[PDB]
From Swiss-Prot, chain A:
The chain holds residues 3264 to 3569 of 7096 of the full protein. It catalyses: TSAVLQ-|-SGFRK-NH2 and SGVTFQ-|-GKFKK the two peptides corresponding to the two self-cleavage sites of the SARS 3C-like proteinase are the two most reactive peptide substrates. The enzyme exhibits a strong preference for substrates containing Gln at P1 position and Leu at P2 position. This is 3C-like proteinase nsp5. 3CL-PRO exists as monomer and homodimer. Only the homodimer shows catalytic activity. Interacts with host FBXO22; this interaction promotes the proteasomal degradation of nsp5. There is a cross-link at K5, K90 (Glycyl lysine isopeptide (Lys-Gly) (interchain with G-Cter in ubiquitin)). The gene is rep. It comes from Severe acute respiratory syndrome coronavirus 2.
């Protein structure tokens, strides 16, 4: 029993974190095989924040302008290239702790673990979700750029996020490991702002299913809803639309608990209307939306506490 | 910016987890130097657990009755003994991934990271506090016994918890690595219950400081109070007493933010007496008590390992 924000064990990623220095800037890089990946803005100076021309900045750099430190060891850079907003530094040594890995670009609502690092050394690990507005609500200080987000499945690390910047509202923006930003953001210091965010409806439903599996039913009701009526209500609370894809994805949790998806939609509708009236769900007084259907199945018992 | 429930990086502990099997029971062990540590209840059948005599059950077992698997490799057990409620299996090979470590017993209110494991395979990491009632609000399924909790200081892993059981309310109980239980619990299938829990006041104050540092200031007010007056409010609301040591520990946060502890105690008193009035603090509608003062300082400073 229990239900926690649970991250993946971070050791496989810890073995890949290095420190990249260019001029006076130091940030983190990810060392896989003989390549170190890091945000391309490591090459910007004070004058390159608003309108950097990364091609012109990079052509002026030689391999030995990049200092890469893995633990106490200097790595020698023997090549460099830019791919979208990530810099790929070829180094003379393959990382002997390279795990089985892949690069995956995720969709809004997906979760992943973040290994926050500073000067190439990891500080902590926590769970994040890609918000509908393509930001993440992380915990990042200066020096954390190049920290990565990931999932682990059967000893294979799927890298899905690299940290690039903090927006004015205190939320965070970054790229996949191919250097393509999530959302409309760019690696420039011009005024940009996250769109209005919304609640991840399919995840809230997943977490309500988690609560039932762990033995709590107080929020259910005798009602159902059509999918369209549910969506008409939920968008009045700034909830994301629920699609037939989402209904299908919730099938397994519905079968395990015996609660039809649209019946749990009816429970959510009433929860938005009523609040919790001094009660909690899985220890929270708010509706939680950073557990996916897959997250719930991976953490919860396959046997409902009836 | 940002404030998240954050665990220590778990790599140093992952390299120590092994699978321990005795008869039909598989659970997790901690492999350090040439010893594997696991719950002594690994040797019990279901019937044994109704009333186990552990020394008696252990005599019947021989070294080859303990199957220990590190990843894909078997470890040969060459000795076995008990220390309190943990079994110590001496093996032929020292763990080459043994970190610098110590065994430490923590105090209620202190936090630690839990590496949840099944069949010797780490599955997840999360942050826990030792509750005042000596339980932890963990997330564990069957097969999780022997999963461990820890803190890291520089390069040194301080192991503080080994998982042994789940109580009927779904919270969890275990031992330190010397096998001493946290709380009034025993490793046998008998009637046991979590006692009434309380809220960890110094941690709530720490988290309020975290909120101020992150720009969440609506609950600040012009008032202050005294330790004696506040502790009357704390006891009324089932909060732990605040001591002068707690005030001293929060000293740095009071200096950094300009809210003295008794100044912040006045904010907390008002939150206890009136509620949150529809507002949230660091995205919570509840007052969070599983961040210590050091947790807040570490995460708002960027200390690494
Ligand atoms: N200054 C930063 C950077 Cl560069 C990245 N993440 C967070 C902050 Cl506050
Ligand atoms: N059955 C258990 C055990 Cl033995 C330990 N932790 C949690 C659970 Cl649900
Ligand atoms: Cl006053
Ligand atoms: Na005050």
């Amino acid at each position: 029993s229990g239900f926690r924000k649970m991250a993946f064990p971070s050791g496989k990623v810890e073995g890949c974190m290095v420190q990249v220095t260019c001029g006076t800037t130091t940030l983190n890089g990810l060392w896989l095989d003989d390549v170190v990946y890091c945000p391309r803005h490591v090459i910007c100076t004070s004058e390159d924040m608003l309108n950097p021309n990364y091609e012109d900045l990079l052509i002026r750099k030689s391999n030995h302008n990049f200092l890469v430190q893995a633990g106490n060891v200097q790595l020698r850079v023997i090549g460099h290239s830019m791919q979208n907003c990530v810099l790929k530094l070829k180094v003379d040594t393959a990382n002997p702790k390279t795990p089985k890995y892949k690069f995956v670009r995720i969709q809004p609502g997906q979760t992943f673990s973040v290994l926050a690092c500073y000067n190439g050394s990891p500080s902590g690990v926590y769970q994040c979700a890609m918000r509908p507005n393509f930001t993440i609500k992380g915990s990042f200080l200066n020096g954390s750029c190049g920290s990565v987000g990931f999932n682990i499945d059967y000893d294979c690390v799927s890298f899905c996020y690299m940290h690039h910047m903090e927006l004015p509202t205190g939320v965070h923006a970054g790229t996949d490991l191919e250097g393509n930003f999530y959302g409309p953001f760019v690696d420039r210091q011009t005024a940009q702002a996250a769109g209005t965010d919304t609640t991840i409806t399919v995840n809230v439903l997943a977490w309500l299913y988690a609560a039932v599996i762990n033995g709590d039913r107080w929020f259910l009701n005798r009602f159902t809803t059509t999918l369209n009526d549910f969506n008409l209500v939920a968008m009045k609370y700034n909830y994301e639309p629920l699609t037939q894809d989402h209904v299908d994805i919730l099938g397994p949790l519905s079968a395990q608990t015996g609660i039809a998806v649209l019946d749990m939609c009816a429970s959510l509708k009433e929860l938005l209307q009523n609040g919790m009236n001094g009660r909690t769900i899985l220890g929270s007084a708010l509706l939680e939306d950073e557990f996916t259907p897959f997250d719930v199945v991976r953490q919860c018992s396959g046997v409902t506490f009836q």
